[PDB]
Write an enzyme that holds these catalytic residues in place. Sequence first.
Site, short mmCIF file in Angstrom:
data_model
loop_
_atom_site.label_atom_id
_atom_site.label_comp_id
_atom_site.label_asym_id
_atom_site.label_seq_id
_atom_site.Cartn_x
_atom_site.Cartn_y
_atom_site.Cartn_z
N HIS B 81 4.78 29.04 -9.48
CA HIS B 81 5.60 27.83 -9.66
C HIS B 81 5.08 26.66 -10.55
CE1 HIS B 81 6.75 29.18 -5.54
NE2 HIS B 81 8.09 28.84 -5.98
N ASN B 112 -3.65 29.19 -7.95
CA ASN B 112 -2.18 28.94 -7.51
C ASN B 112 -2.70 28.13 -5.99
OD1 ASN B 112 0.38 28.69 -6.93
ND2 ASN B 112 0.76 30.80 -7.09
MG LIG Z 1 2.09 27.56 -6.54
#
Ligand SMILES: [Mg+2]
Lengths: 300, 299
Positions: B81, B112
């Site tokens: 994201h 991440n």
């Molecule tokens: Mg992430």
Amino acid sequence: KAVLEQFGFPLTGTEARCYTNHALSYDQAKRVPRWVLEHISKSKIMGDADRKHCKFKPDPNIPPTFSAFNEDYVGSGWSRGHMAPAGNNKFSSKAMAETFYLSNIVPQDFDNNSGYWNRIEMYCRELTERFEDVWVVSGPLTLPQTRGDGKKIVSYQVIGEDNVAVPSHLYKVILARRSSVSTEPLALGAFVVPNEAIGFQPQLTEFQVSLQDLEKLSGLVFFPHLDRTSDIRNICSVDTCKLLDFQEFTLYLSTRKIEGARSVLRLEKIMENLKNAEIEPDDYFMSRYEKKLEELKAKE
Amino acid sequence: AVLEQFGFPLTGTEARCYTNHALSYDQAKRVPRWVLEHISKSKIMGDADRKHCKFKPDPNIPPTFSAFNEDYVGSGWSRGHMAPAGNNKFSSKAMAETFYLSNIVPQDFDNNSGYWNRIEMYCRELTERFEDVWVVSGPLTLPQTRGDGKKIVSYQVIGEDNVAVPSHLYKVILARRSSVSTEPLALGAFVVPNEAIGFQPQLTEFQVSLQDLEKLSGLVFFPHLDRTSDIRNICSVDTCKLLDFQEFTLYLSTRKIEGARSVLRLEKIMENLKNAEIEPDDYFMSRYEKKLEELKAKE
Ligand SMILES: [Mg+2]
Ligand SMILES: [Mg+2]
């Protein structure tokens, strides 16, 4: 949306930029055009605009922090390659000068620029002999290669202090319309060539790709107003996609060299090279050759 | 007019606006160029549940230019994201839109779940001290210099659609204390490599000038911001202090409680935390006891 946009969305600088006889979208990260669109006709490729008077310079409309500069190219090993070529703009010295803005320029292999790519440019102009209107979109690509471990990798050199991206490949999309009132379908072709020396063995159709494949490679949609449900002909079927062969291209280049010869000895050399290549001069070469001989005889 | 008779080529870079983020998409790389979001105290609170969300192609992107889950799954890269789910607890719709693949880049798994997550948590922490925080996040493919001095950009592309794996990720943070405060805005720009990063480097080690990031990215951020006015360095008026190993590990362990399906797993969370030589805090023990009672009350 208002809350997010309070201090503005980031700017990508991809808006279409218009010049006298071409338009482009610029890539501010790579310092090269993404695409350059031009229109060619019989009358635009005639005239007295002279490429010798033009010089490369940063596009004054590009923020300098995102512009390339001549210092990025000179001595890099790469030539400044026009996307919209100077030769499409003999009709206007202003239009020609604007093709020398670096917004129209990519780092191009010297031999590709003066060889295969030039022959494609010449074919695009030749199309105006048979079609009233020709549109061309030209641009760079950085395509992947599969390395030894099976991973696909996009690798490209960046040159100069400004990190101008050197493409792996160049594309052209050619659209031709017979006349503005004809009911004949339009003719279209898309081509991708590597940014390296290419000789005379491969015919242009070897570099032809489907329009959809090029759009997927480039992330672009070309000629979006073009109705793709209508019949559109393959340009290599309705026309020739035949580039000049070695003899024709060498004769062309030798003829061009006449006009820059500054001595009679240089002229005779040009002739002897043509004769040693077993290429017979045509009437046009002999006209220019004899006029240049007389001109040089009449000067200091 | 003749030149344009059949249209200019389309680059597809127009700003696309969603419930709580906006982005410009790169159709060639199949990733966003930039993703802008706004964060506040109220938006990071609510009952929107990340576990209900699904990654899917953005329905607004032409399929020919979209990534698909098949490009990511089994690639060695995670779906990262740019606008995080956790910034959108207030709205199930807003959160779901962050799982459109138009918000996603191929991201190193440890980055991440580690350093990048810690940066994301710092951005949310800022809402305790600034009423409004704007964040622009995105990918970069930067060059490396070869032994002969040649500078080369190299990046992997994954899946049938050749989704571009960035070498680095950037964040630009812009913070305003209140709608009526007179003090200048706070801004910072940061660039991190798309790889595992531990706890030794402080966030400021990855700080760059806004001008440098714009040169690297080919972007101009927050163009309405008057850079004549004095804009303060966010790391001068705030801390740019990320959670440390003990704080972050405790945070991760506390999260794992809520997913425990057995007293067995619940006890192993406690064991791992202690064998990391970290002692639980009151909040951990609160959630831990709540979960122990819950699991004993279930089959
Ligand atoms: Mg992430
Ligand atoms: Mg050229």
